[PDB]
User: Which sequence fits this backbone?
């Protein structure tokens, strides 16, 4: 369901400043997760296209919406990894 | 959604607080999530409208498209905002 | 909106102050928002005019719309220039 | 406008002064604005002419000028990258 | 290959053991090799399938697309592992900084 | 070249001997040279084949349209694709080895750190 | 230049003598410079070859069609739609465009060489740091 993914990513992209080392590490796990989501959706869409090749239902278009969202999520997380690096650089800079 | 609400919201969102750069870098990912949800949600609504149709209604569809395009731009802006924060830090480090 | 007003406005906006490069990087995103709003608002009006019709004026808004597209391209390009200028500064040092 | 003037103007404009690379990078955006204004003004004039005609410099001549400005806009866009490349080359030859 | 097998394999792989950071840094390259081999082999199999079909056609289903899904996934995996390497460095910079 | 041979070779190559970190740092460049030579040579072969393809294409044009004095295209573009697979693999190999160079430094930074 | 000569040359160049590490660091700069020059020369050569290619293309197109001067002409009356295929297979065009592509390969190899050498400088620094570390 679209809103579930929206909510899940919203939780995922948050960065806990107090635990930056964990967050840097966990970011790769997040990437794996959304890569799996993204990947599975492609499989579902393929199955529909295989079944269609048998010859009202907006299914395929709906999966497409999820697929694009997961693309955005993958982008967001890749971006998140960078933010963590940026934050550490700023911390280092602010010190002597 | 009202366009002007989104316009004003983005205008507030892209502001960069020079004094709180670490926060801004982390928060940028969250902003990306928010507008991604907006963009994502608009597509779902447009799908629903086209599904329900399957004269007044085909105007509505055109209006959401305007909102969809605005959110596309917002995602670009926010992505771009993230880069600016990195650019600003590099300049600061350079100046030292 | 008047076309020449946008022309003068973009012309002022794209200027880059080298002495305040950090500000310019941040404000560039803000400029993008501003012109993104202009572009966005023009489309709504064109939708309203075509809806009321459902055509010379329509054409004029199109010109303003096309210009705002250009502004957005310019502002995007401006952001890159600012990074490029920094890269040049760092290198020469 | 005379075509030959625009030709000459652009020829001067696309030149890159390597000795002032930072200035050229910044000013290129200003150049884009300039030609965007030219291009924009021509469309308006052609619109004015088509309107006056629909009530009853040749329309065709403006088209020649309009197209030139398109090419010009293309040239200035390309130039920003050309400018980037000169810097890249410097970094490359420096091994840095 | 099954997609779900690849999904699970990567999920196990990207985990970072903080207690063995030096090992993880070294082994990360090995993971890249492993997934590059997966990616590479899938491409070879896809070539074999497409070639045998284009020989039969000259003389005269969803498989090939499914491999494509696996192929694209392995790209992501390779990207993730490249990313894992950076993450490990980031964590080390952080360890050093906090001291 | 056989793809599986390259797969196996890279797998041996990217291994890092923790006990000989300085040697590994030095040898990594040597490895880079090795795969760069592979990558480079594959491009040369692909160039030879692409020339063969442009001749086969003309032969095919002449065969139809009734010219000549007195199958091949499909074979050539298959070979070409196989070499393409090896080429892509070697790109990845170069990435891996570049990455291996960084890993070695990262490990040393960690050792120095752990040394108080 | 022959590709295999470059391959052999780089292989010799990137070797690191641990006993003369400061020297290797200084000479690494010279190596980069050396390969930067190869790269620079190759660009000049390719630019020259492309000119030769534009002369071969004009000469062969005149040969395969109706030309103003010339006596030896093609008895295969090739049409405009066939001309790209015919030109790409022509002995002279093919020879010139292979050389060009070959030089392009040499250019790419030198890019790679520059990457390797840049990397070599860091490897040398890393090794010195390690030695200092095991010492202190």
Assistant:
């Amino acid at each position: 369901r679209l809103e579930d993914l929206q909510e899940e990513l919203k939780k995922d992209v948050f960065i806990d400043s107090t635990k930056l080392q964990y967050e840097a590490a966990n970011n790769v796990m997040l990437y794996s997760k959304w890569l799996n989501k993204h990947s599975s959706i492609k499989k579902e869409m393929l199955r529909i296209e295989a079944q269609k090749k048998v010859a009202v239902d907006t299914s395929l278009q709906y999966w497409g919406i999820l697929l694009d969202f997961c693309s955005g999520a993958l982008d967001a997380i890749k971006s998140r990894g960078f933010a963590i690096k940026h934050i550490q650089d700023m911390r280092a800079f602010e010190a002597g």
Remarks:
- The helical segments of chain E are 3-13, 21-59, 63-98.
- Residues 1-99 of chain E form one domain.
- The radius of gyration of chain E is 18 Å.
